[PDB]
Assembly symmetry: C3
Amino acid sequence: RTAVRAAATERDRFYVCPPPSGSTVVRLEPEQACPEYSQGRNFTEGIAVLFKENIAPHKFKAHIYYKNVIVTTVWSGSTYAAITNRFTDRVPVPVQEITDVIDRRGKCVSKAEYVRNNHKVTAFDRDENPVEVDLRPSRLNALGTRGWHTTNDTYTKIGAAGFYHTGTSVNCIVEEVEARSVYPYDSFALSTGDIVYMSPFYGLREGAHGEHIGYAPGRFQQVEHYYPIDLDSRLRASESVTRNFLRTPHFTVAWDWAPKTRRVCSLAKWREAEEMIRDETRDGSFRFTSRALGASFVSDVTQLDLQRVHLGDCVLREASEAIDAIYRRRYNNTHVLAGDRPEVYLARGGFVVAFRPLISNELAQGHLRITTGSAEFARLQFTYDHIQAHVNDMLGRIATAWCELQNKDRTLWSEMSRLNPSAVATAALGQRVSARMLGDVMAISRCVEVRGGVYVQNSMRVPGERGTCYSRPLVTFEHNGTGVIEGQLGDDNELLISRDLIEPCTGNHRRYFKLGSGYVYYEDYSYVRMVEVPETISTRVTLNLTLLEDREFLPLEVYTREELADTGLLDYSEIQRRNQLHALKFYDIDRVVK
Amino acid sequence: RTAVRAAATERDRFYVCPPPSGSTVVRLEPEQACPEYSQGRNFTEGIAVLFKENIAPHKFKAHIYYKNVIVTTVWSGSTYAAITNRFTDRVPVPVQEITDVIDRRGKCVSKAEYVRNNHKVTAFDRDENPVEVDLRPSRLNALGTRGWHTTNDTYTKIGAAGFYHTGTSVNCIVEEVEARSVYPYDSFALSTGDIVYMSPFYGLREGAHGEHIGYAPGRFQQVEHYYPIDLDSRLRASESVTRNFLRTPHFTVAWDWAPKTRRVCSLAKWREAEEMIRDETRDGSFRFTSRALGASFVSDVTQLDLQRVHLGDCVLREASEAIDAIYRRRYNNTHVLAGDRPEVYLARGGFVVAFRPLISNELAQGHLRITTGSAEFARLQFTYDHIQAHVNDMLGRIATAWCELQNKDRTLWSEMSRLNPSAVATAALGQRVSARMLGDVMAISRCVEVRGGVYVQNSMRVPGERGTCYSRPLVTFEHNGTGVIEGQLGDDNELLISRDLIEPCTGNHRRYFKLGSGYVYYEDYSYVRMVEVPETISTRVTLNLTLLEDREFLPLEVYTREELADTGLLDYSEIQRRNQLHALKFYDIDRVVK
Amino acid sequence: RTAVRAAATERDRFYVCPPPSGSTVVRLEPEQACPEYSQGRNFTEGIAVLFKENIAPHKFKAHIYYKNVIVTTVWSGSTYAAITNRFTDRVPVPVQEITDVIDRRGKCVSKAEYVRNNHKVTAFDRDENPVEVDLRPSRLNALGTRGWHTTNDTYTKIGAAGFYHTGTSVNCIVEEVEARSVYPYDSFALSTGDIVYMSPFYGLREGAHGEHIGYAPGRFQQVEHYYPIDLDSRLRASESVTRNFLRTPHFTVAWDWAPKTRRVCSLAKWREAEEMIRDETRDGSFRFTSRALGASFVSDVTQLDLQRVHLGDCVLREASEAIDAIYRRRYNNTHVLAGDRPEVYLARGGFVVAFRPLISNELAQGHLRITTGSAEFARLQFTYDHIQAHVNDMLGRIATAWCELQNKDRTLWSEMSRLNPSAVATAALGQRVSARMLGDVMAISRCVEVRGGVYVQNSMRVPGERGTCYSRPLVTFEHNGTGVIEGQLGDDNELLISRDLIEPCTGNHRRYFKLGSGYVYYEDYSYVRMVEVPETISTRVTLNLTLLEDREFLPLEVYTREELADTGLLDYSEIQRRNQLHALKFYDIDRVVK
Ligand SMILES: *[C@@H]1O[C@H](CO)[C@@H](O)[C@H](O)[C@H]1NC(C)=O
Ligand SMILES: *[C@@H]1O[C@H](CO)[C@@H](O)[C@H](O)[C@H]1NC(C)=O
Ligand SMILES: *[C@@H]1O[C@H](CO)[C@@H](O)[C@H](O)[C@H]1NC(C)=O
């Protein structure tokens, strides 16, 4: 009939629970309203053709006609000859001579009649009389680089010693040439290095005449219904052309006249987006997403008027073509196109989007200069948006289910609140409380810590009654004023003010009761030992979520600025640097003879 | 009083539950410690100005002064004239003549006095006496490309037949020219194609004299307090300059002298980051994140000393300007700048970050050559980090709530463990067990499978007692040694060793008892049929999480390397290729006359 | 003994629950099968070397040998001299003279003997007799740009007035030159601006002879066992070479012959991936992921045969080198390489991947033209894949735990279904139902709304019995036909058909009963007031998931197309534009003398 002193730790403290009066009354919180997230997105399927700023020059075929005049002064000596001069000059071939000699016969006159220093001057091949010479192809002739000439020889004079002799070579040259024009196209340059200070689209028939010409009107001429001739097979072409001719002091250049608007565009077809999705979730903007491309393009809801664009005719033409070609190939039997024409938008970063919506059979029943850079932002827009939408959708789904689960699981908590309102209110409040059901509502009283040392009684027998025992052990403790309380060991370290927990005594009685950090072992209503229960059972579900690791994105380049500038056979600046030093490098230019 | 043989499937097996002794005792696992993830990040708001490596040349205005000497040899014939020679040469205009004739009067002398082949030589326009000729503007004169000349004519000699005549043209030319200097700036080049082998910042006053000059000291001269004159309105400028003059063998070039450090910088302003956030979560590094830019820049915690940078003066100057301008515009009333100066860092990929922290009013109370490439890594750093931080934060939040929920829900499991310790321990252990509460701890015994065929008894009446019935059906089975057991059908296919489940008989008795894969139907304490219960009730919450789909990022380029190299009017290498073939193409250079 | 009219709102409606017959019987839905997501990925560790398309020209050292012939015509006057002509021409130095005079003595003959206009011509320095002159270095000589010449003077004739005098300068020049060849390498260009129309790898020994030569066979020559000499220290090199010589009309160029396959490759080493992971999860493809690089490269499972590549010899050579070097440095003691050679693949976007798997010590016991652009797609592939895999893994983990948790928590629901089948079935069905356990299955009946006004009875005393009271209040209501029902207030607004809920009366009786939107207060079995219970207790766990915000990725470029084209000292096209205007700008070319 002795006593064992109980031991309490912080976490495993003893508690007294004063009876709850109706002073504080609580209800179990009703089911919450669940978060409803964006279920369904607003969009349009279609076909798109993306256009970029045209950066390429206007390229066209042309012919250069000139006579290569070389004048050589030789000083004939005793046992040698020395070139004292070799003066070279390209001279134009008149239009008359092109059409009437060169096209007509494939011959060229052995003389030149041109203006130099404002004086009318002449040059005769071999210092001889004019003869129409045949134009023979060069040995080096190749596709797009054919040339014809009249001589393989450069005339030089063979004379008497102690004299200066002058010979004159005249080689008539016709060359297939490639021309290039860079915006605004007020000039062009030929494969020969010659720049023509005139518009390639300059003509005399209306529209064309309001194009630049840096040359006097007499230097230019057009020849309508001109049927070109091959200077090898001397055959004419089946279709005629308006042939432009410009006579400069060093050559005559010819090219086929064509109207600017047909030949040139300020924009260029970049890519086709066969499965283009136009998103309409964000307001006042469209977002053109392409799975194929891995790119999103943001534009306004309002269309681009292509009349604002200088030379934007190619857009609608090339866009309708590819869209119509795609439709035929991919949607002909499943869908129908919308609105008898494609829609055109100005997307972020200088991209022009020509989009045409796809309608399923079932649902059918101020001047602008567009500058384009990279499409790097658009792929990033794509990547980000694809992930953001997914994780947003999925967390939405978790949030709702978390709410829904807790709402359902309230049935379990209400049911427990009828039976054990205290353990429910302790879980809810997160602090040790005593509770009583006052019908359909709980009365709450807080539980207070027992600081004065607690002692367990060795026997569990009712003193004065055989056959009746106490179900849980007896304790002695200090709470409030009364220094000693004849109490009982309740549940989860609650000490009971009274001793009313009873049971008829049973044979082979084994009990483990929680007492502080551990357990007290009782055998046949008598204290035995202070045991430990190290074995546990868990109804928990493991959720191991690991973190998304740090990643370092270091600068990465396939080719550098240096590598990209070093691809050429020659570098103008590098050559000039070295070349312009030649006089200072191999001569004393600073010395002066007295 | 017959029997029906029960049918067990794998999943719906019969079990016998031996009584649990205190041999194995368990506790319900206490509430766990919950994961606490990084709640709050360390950062600094501010304003930044990003600087990139200067790739642009130093551009400045200049003037070229030369006399264009053309000497023509004409051979007058019977009925013609032929140019046998036309020798062209640019000659310098002496400084004396620039200041005393050209600036003073707007005139130029009709002769040239220069050195060629180390000999002092002269050239007279029209082979006549020296006259100061007025400089008239060219017809083609435009903004930044003005030129003045003295003649429109090229003098040629008109003489007697059978003779060689020589005429001399001298055109004095002054041209507005644009100059460019590329690092290290020891030379410059003019719009005319001429390279000047000297520093644009070379002077004679201290500092400037230790700059390259590839020319003899006599060829150079500075003119202090020089007031320039317009050669059209012959008005002088209000402010004077130090005027540099360099006389080369072919021209005199003049330019305004300026000190290198003022005019040139090795870095260039790239972008302003108005809302720059400097992250301080990772140690030994700063991360400059810009929402505006969509870029993160990683640098050291230690500042960049701009004294390590060759020509880094522009940085602090231009950074303070833009930061101060931004502050005035965006933060003037809400915040205050910090530390009387902006901080400077060397970020990853060659970016210089000039950052100045923003302090809210409430909180206020070895030589370096910087190489820059792309900012592609920085946008990727940004994207990745923005997503990683969000998903890490959100999963952290799920992890904690999962722990917290299970911790709360332990109140429900403990409560059940008092009432039904077996069903709790079976859920926990994940295997069929029998359990008994030994006070505050459970005794566990495992349940064993009944392999010997089971039979249900047709009646549920107590033999020998009217008015008392068995609550659940009677069974017969084989377990351990004893071949026949007079048992009862327990819960969820548990077969009971005994027959102690009793109830006073009731009128209109209908029962469905689980027996193997299905149910046994009993009516008024008598077997009827083997029914199926196909209807279910579920308290589950659906969570449909779908996977983030695979995405293919295919190579994408707006303009190729080819497209970017093809934008020019001429290509030096292409022209040279064709041009240097001309002799081989239109002549036989290999033939020799015997 | 009066009555108070109850008030019902939508959400807090009154219900009558008809008794359930076995008409509808339900079971609680058994535990579900849980989703099992991809646990474990298939991959190979190794080392990789990435190769890109070679964009760089073939660069090699060379020497240019020529004699700079200048012929000057001076007209001596009264008090002056005028240059009437200055004709410049570069002439070749014969191979004989290079080896026998220039290499042998470091001297060059003061005359030139060359062919011009098909005529054999001579040039004498100072119009004097041939002398072997020493080659002296230029003042400007620098590393890689050395030059040697024979004179600093340009010979001019000083004569009698009224006469034309002609002088001849011959300067023999040898220059260290840099050569460049661009694919297909059928020509090369020198630092001087000269293009050599021949292959740098053309030779006469087998293999080399099937390479382009645009020159007659006599113009070329190889010199085997040639030991070069420094023209400063007149020392010979220790190792000999096969020396190529090509005599063009303007110079002799020499270079060391080397075989094409050794000197040139169509691919170039880009980066080393020390920790390259080759993923094998997607079928019919490999994915080469590099943490270091932040890039993923997609290729076929089938290797690249490098015999399909024109000049692909560098790949295997350079790949084995770096891989073997890396292994030695990082894996020598932990792993072993696999398969006696590296594997080679053709990745997406023109990248060649040379991968060699790493085997841990423990586990050991048609013609192709490759075009490369950017690696932008590969970093995006990397970023996306890294995130996708993580979030997919983590949601998988949530999905399984959600299933597992609900499966466990079924133990709680079954247990409640025995005690309160109605509250379980109401939670499950999401509608108010009455339920009865018919053994191991529930009988369900739906609950109907009470529309006819309800009234609570002021007393809770059993009329006719003292000491016995009703536990819950009495009500009067209208349901079905019977206009008045002597009922009782049940749980959660259920009205009971009968009045069988009883309790022995207790002293100090306080009760709150739910009645519609609120509560009814009862004191000592008598009505008092209609109270409100505003205080709640919650067992809910907060889960605050916020959305991933929209981000705008705006176009961002470090340097523009314009900025990148403006880095050069000169621009060929810009210079030519201005230069070719000179005649039109400073002269009247259109005027003609009559
Ligand atoms: C040049 O010479 C070749 C023969 O070597 C000949 O075929 C060709 O027709 C000649 N061309 C001219 C224009 O004389
Ligand atoms: C050139 O001629 C035009 C008239 O055609 C005239 O206006 C201009 O002043 C002249 N220039 C010179 C330098 O003679
Ligand atoms: C050129 O002159 C310098 C002296 O000014 C001298 O050192 C050099 O050797 C000379 N070169 C030749 C080739 O005469």
